[model samples]
Target: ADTLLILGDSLSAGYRMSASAAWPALLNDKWQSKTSVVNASISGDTSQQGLARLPALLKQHQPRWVLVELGGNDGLRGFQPQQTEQTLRQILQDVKAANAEPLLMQIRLPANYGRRYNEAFSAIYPKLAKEFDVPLLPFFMEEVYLKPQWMQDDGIHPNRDAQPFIADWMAKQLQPLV
Candidate 1:
């Protein structure tokens, strides 16, 4: 009743950075007053893995809200949009069935991933969100994507310095939901 579970990916898993420097830890610090945050995110995992892990997480955390941030890896690998969408659709279904509000995070790929594929991949989040009646949260890294100092060499992951800033910004984004 007082916890929010994050079923996410590398970004959620503290990729290339110390776990202590990851946003989830900082988010937990900033958001403790609202609800406890459980990061069940695994690095480089695609939608399928989360769908697999979710049942266990739901039973353990019994979170009131589950923020899903997956599918970027699927898009990066150029998986057919339908396949990705189908998996995501089930994630929403499961979270809802478990009686937790689901927050789907928008995911995008680098431009070189091919414009047509990117467009198709991007469409799935809002499409599914509308169907599931949940909020499609903005890609949490978008603003950090805008700030040079906040990004890592690949312009995909955030630099260590970005965690505290991102944690604070994310707190604002999730507070309204709380």
Candidate 2:
């Protein structure tokens, strides 16, 4: 396998933990010698920021599998949904155009944001996944939420203990593609 690029926002950046304990790092360690995984995640990034950051990363690493996990900040900040969609669309197009396989990680917020907003904002992930015809991880934080030990004090970010689960799940998703 060639290089695997993990790109996204705070979730993927491991904002609440040391860089070594991040899921991406854990994934890389598990896949070491088999594949090289480049983590290009940034804290507080939206799809727009991802759109801007991706090109250079692509040019530099020229990865084979590109895991794109973005757009949560847009929803949190309540940015225009259309703008987020557009940015992600272009990123997908560019990733494939660069001859790299794109993988989208879907995200859904809590219900407090209201059903209408949740539906529209959440739809972006599947829409792009279908349009781009790429493999997707529906939601990143699954069992982590159910297990108190998997989260930080804020309960929003995953704790060091949860890295294995997240990274292992991602590795499973990338298996067939690789």
Candidate 3:
């Protein structure tokens, strides 16, 4: 059996929902005992915080794959994209050093954030994916974000009802990688 560790923020943490209602937990259900999926997400975490916590997780889980879902807070808060990218790069490097496959999930910022900033922030994922030779999963909230019913009151985190859809989408992306 293989283990997959998800390191992310509130989106992956199921902010307003139960832990079992989170996409990562749903993924574990979908896999049906074939793999161990651990959700190690922190609400309000920036990429830097995630990077800081990653080493301990890498050592504790020793996961075969490390799916990075950070950077949203950084982008949303208008932090420098270059700094976010650097933090992610270091995280991936450490993941590689741990002999784990590093996977990145693109983060989508609201349109109001300005085209220039959004574009620069969005580009970080693929660039890192290419540079680090990792798999880049499309932004997890891509479809859900467009539908109001799928979102929470904050308009960022998805509602519990959206978990299945998110899980299904992620499971597909993860299939070949795992």
Write the candidate numbers in order of decreasing lDDT: 3, 1, 2
Better of 1 and 3 by lDDT: 3
Better of 1 and 2 by lDDT: 1
lDDT of 1: 0.88
TM-score for each of the candidates: 0.96, 0.95, 0.97
The numbered model that scores best in lDDT is 3
lDDT of 1 by residue, 97-176 (tens): 99999999999888888888889999999999989889888997888888999888887888888888878877888888
Please tell me which model should have the higher TM-score, number 1 or number 3: 3
lDDT, model 2, position 108 = 80
Worst 10 residues of 3 by lDDT: 138-147
Predicted candidate 3 versus true structure: per-residue lDDT over 30-100, tens digit per residue: 89879999999988999999999999999999999999999999999999999999999999999999999
lDDT of 3: 0.92
Q: lDDT of model 2 at residue 54?
A: 91
Q: Which model is ahead, 2 or 3, in terms of lDDT?
A: 3
Clash pairs, candidate 3, are none
